[PDB]
A paper describes a structure:
Can f 6, a recently identified lipocalin allergen produced from the submaxillary gland and detected in dander, shows a high amino acid sequence identity with Fel d 4 (67%) and Equ c 1 (55%), major cat and horse lipocalin allergens, respectively. Lipocalins are characterised by a common tertiary structure exhibiting an eight-stranded, antiparallel β-sheet closed back on itself forming a continuous hydrogen-bonded β-barrel.
In this study, we produced a recombinant protein of the dog lipocalin allergen Can f 6 (rCan f 6) and determined its three-dimensional structure at 2.35 Å resolution. rCan f 6 crystals diffracted to 2.35 Å resolution and the structure was refined to an R-factor of 20.3% and an Rfree of 26.9%. For the final model, four rCan f 6 molecules consisting of chains A to D were contained in an asymmetric unit and had nearly identical structures with an average root mean square deviation (RMSD) of 0.63 Å for main-chain atoms. Two regions with high RMSD, Leu50–Ser53 and Val111–Gln115, are located on the extruded turn and exposed to the solvent. For Leu50–Ser53, chain C exhibits an alternate conformation due to the lack of hydrogen bond(s) between the Oδ/Nδ atom(s) of Asn52 and Oγ atom of Ser54. The high RMSD at Val111–Gln115 reflects differences in packing environments among the four molecules. All other regions are superimposable among the four molecules in the asymmetric unit with low RMSD, indicating that the four molecules have essentially the same structures. The estimated molecular mass was 19.9 kDa, indicating that rCan f 6 is present as a monomer in solution. Hilger et al. modelled the tertiary structure of Can f 6 and Fel d 4 in silico based on the crystal structure of Equ c 1 and showed that these allergens share highly conserved structural characteristics as well as amino acid sequence identity. Consistent with these findings, the X-ray crystal structure characteristics of Can f 6 remarkably resembled those of Equ c 1.
Author numbering: 6 to 164
Write the structure that this text describes.
């Protein structure tokens, strides 16, 4: 059951897996890029803040990190500081299957977007993935800038 607004944030908590990653600047999400991090779980706090626990590669090793995201004034939007100021929202979710987040990173040099699909399981339906691709094309992210992480190291081994 697919939700596209009025998200019930309580239902996005718990464990997720990073499945697709996309950006309008490809380097951001390729190996070594600052945005190539692999979600573990999302914790929702009493003040509506969210804590993303994730893994990133540090000298070849999966290292746990924690991202604090705060609700902005604007509805559905969150901000988080990581390699700049990021504003993000939920595009779509089936709470027990997948979720798609859109993010704008603002920085002195060049704004970029990210799009990410997480699954409750390590993989999701190829239909869902195609739907993520079309959302990306609508946002001027070309399909060549869309990485599927199911057959690469995404720190599953460190979870």
């Amino acid at each position: 059951d697919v939700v596209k607004g009025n998200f019930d944030i309580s239902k996005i908590s718990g464990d997720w897996y990073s499945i697709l990653l996309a950006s309008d600047i490809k380097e951001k999400i390729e190996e070594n890029g600052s945005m190539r991090v692999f979600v573990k779980d999302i914790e929702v706090l009493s003040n509506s803040s969210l804590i993303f626990t994730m893994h990133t590669k540090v000298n070849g090793k999966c290292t746990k990190i924690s991202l604090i995201c705060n609700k902005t004034e604007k509805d559905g939007e969150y901000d988080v500081v990581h390699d700049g100021y990021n504003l993000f929202r939920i595009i779509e979710t089936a709470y027990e299957d997948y979720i798609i987040f859109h993010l704008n990173n603002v920085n002195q040099e060049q704004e970029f977007q990210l799009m990410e699909l997480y699954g409750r399981k390590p993989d999701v339906s190829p239909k869902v993935k195609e739907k993520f691709v079309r959302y990306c094309q609508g946002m001027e992210i070309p399909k060549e800038n869309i990485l599927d992480l199911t057959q690469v190291d995404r720190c599953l081994q460190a979870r």
